[PDB]
């Protein structure tokens, strides 16, 4: 079997184990986690499997080991603006993206797959999401972990979006495909979108973009309030978050 997509990230086994040990050292609330158990549960999800035949059930053992409650009122979701979202939680250190949780941290920027009836990780090729399989070891992992993360969110949930995208809100992102449809009005009062002016100077109100009106319509039918804010100056936004009641701001 040869796929269209790049193979498993080189040194995947080392990276997953080292990330697990580092995260559980930095976060003493997760010190109970056995990182050997985490590796065996992760590997066990997909090794010896046809990589388009991975289910959410295949990840249940890893999900159970990685069980974690972050403050439900301090969640940042993002779509197509990951690096700025991560920089935000690096400066506003009480807030969490999915990749600030143990399971999100383990898998961030990695690709992985195996092959039917072999014991080995495939470093040669993995199914491409677009060309081979929408349901692959990576997409199934992110669907299962991100649903659980979105489900747990409460009060005011923030989502960071990229105002320089053709579609500022799109339904193929993890956010647009799974997270937005798992915010529960039992827990969530408001979704507040931050539309980042991340490219050329652009003075326009991008909260009037048709895709933002689509997002507003989706979360209105979930009985959740919608708020939208332009971030015209993202670098100044990060600075002002670190040091508020200072400078220009």
């Amino acid at each position, epitope marked *: 079997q040869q796929w269209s997509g790049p193979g498993t990230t080189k040194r995947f086994p080392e990276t997953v184990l080292a990330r697990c040990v580092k995260y559980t050292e930095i976060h003493p609330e997760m010190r109970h986690v056995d990182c050997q158990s985490v590796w065996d549960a992760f590997k066990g999800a997909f090794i010896s499997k046809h990589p388009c035949n991975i289910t959410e059930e295949d990840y249940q053992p890893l999900m159970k080991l990685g069980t974690q409650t972050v403050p439900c009122n301090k969640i940042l979701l993002w779509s197509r603006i990951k690096d700025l979202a991560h920089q935000f939680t690096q400066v506003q250190r009480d807030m969490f993206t999915l990749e600030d949780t143990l399971l999100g941290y383990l898998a961030d920027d990695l690709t992985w797959c195996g092959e039917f009836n072999t014991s080995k990780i495939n470093y040669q090729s993995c199914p491409d999401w677009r060309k081979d399989c929408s349901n692959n070891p990576v997409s199934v992992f992110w669907k299962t972990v991100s649903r659980r993360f979105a489900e747990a969110a409460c009060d005011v949930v923030h989502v960071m979006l990229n105002g320089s995208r053709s579609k500022i809100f799109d339904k193929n992102s993890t956010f647009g495909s799974v997270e937005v449809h798992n915010l*529960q*009005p*039992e*827990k969530v009062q408001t979704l507040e979108a931050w539309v980042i002016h991340g490219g050329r100077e652009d003075s326009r109100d991008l909260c009037q973009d048709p895709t933002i009106k689509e997002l507003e319509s989706i979360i209105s*039918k*979930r*009985n*959740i*309030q919608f708020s939208c804010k332009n971030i015209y100056r993202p670098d100044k936004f990060l600075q002002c978050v670190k040091n508020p009641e200072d400078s220009s701001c």
Partner: antibody, heavy 121, light 108 residues
Framework: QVQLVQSGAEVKKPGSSVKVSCKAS????????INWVRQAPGQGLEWMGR????????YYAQKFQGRVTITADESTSTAYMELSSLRSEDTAVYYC??????????????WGQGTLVTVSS | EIVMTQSPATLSVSPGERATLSCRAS??????LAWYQQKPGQAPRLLIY???TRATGIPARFSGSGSGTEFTLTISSLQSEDFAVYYC?????????FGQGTKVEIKR
């Protein structure tokens, strides 16, 4: 809804499935939710799950996730609760109950008359 | 989940007299507390929401009080139609939880 009208009493063998209907007089009002609550004979009330009718979006108590399906059909103004792999301990009166559907108002203002489900060998 | 505990299990009250029912939450539920009346063969009926706000058409003799972990339903003069089971319910923390109820029976 102004009234919730449930289907009649059910008698089931263990391991079987039951589907209880809840017809909304006046239809599903915008931003109201249909909840399902059960009561074992001589015991208290237990919230099971709900549906947002306009998007047929269900949300379940962990106790019932994987065994209950709650749905709503806007076309017929009818909500359903299907409980599968029935156990003797599922013997209860099942109520559909309206709430406001938004954060901070999840109390139950309009209740169906209840449906008795008896599960026994 | 938040555990709701009601006391007493049974309250014997003379017609025309006052009933005081207690509801305790395992942790604070602010004022997001509802009260229901249930008679045999009937669905629960909403009496109070927001700890102290009477639902539409509920008589003035029913009053609710309390905040945080400790709540009271007072029926100031018991009519024959008020003899029933009473349940509290928190809507501060999902999943929604109910007390196991107080039966108000007729003293004679």
């Amino acid at each position: 809804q102004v009234q919730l009208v449930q289907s009649g009493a059910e008698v089931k063998k263990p391991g079987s499935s039951v589907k209880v209907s809840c017809k909304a007089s006046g239809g599903f009002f915008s931003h109201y939710i249909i909840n399902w609550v059960r009561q074992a004979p001589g015991q208290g009330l237990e919230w099971m799950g709900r549906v947002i009718p306009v998007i047929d979006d269900a949300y379940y108590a962990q106790k019932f996730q994987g065994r209950v399906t709650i749905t709503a059909d806007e076309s017929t103004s009818t909500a359903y609760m299907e409980l599968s792999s029935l156990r003797s301990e599922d013997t209860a009166v099942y109520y559909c109950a309206r709430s406001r559907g938004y954060y901070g108002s999840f109390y139950f203002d309009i209740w169906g008359q209840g449906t008795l489900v008896t599960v026994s060998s | 989940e938040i555990v709701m505990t009601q006391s007493p299990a049974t309250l014997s009250v003379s017609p025309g007299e006052r009933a005081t029912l207690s509801c305790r939450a395992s942790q604070s539920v602010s004022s997001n507390l509802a009260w229901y009346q249930q008679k045999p063969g009937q669905a629960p009926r909403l009496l109070i929401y927001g700890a102290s706000t009477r639902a539409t058409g509920i008589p003035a003799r029913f009053s609710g009080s309390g905040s945080g972990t400790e709540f009271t339903l007072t029926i100031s003069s018991l009519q024959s139609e008020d003899f029933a089971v009473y349940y509290c319910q928190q809507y501060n923390n999902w999943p929604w939880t109910f007390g196991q109820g107080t039966k108000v029976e007729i003293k004679r």
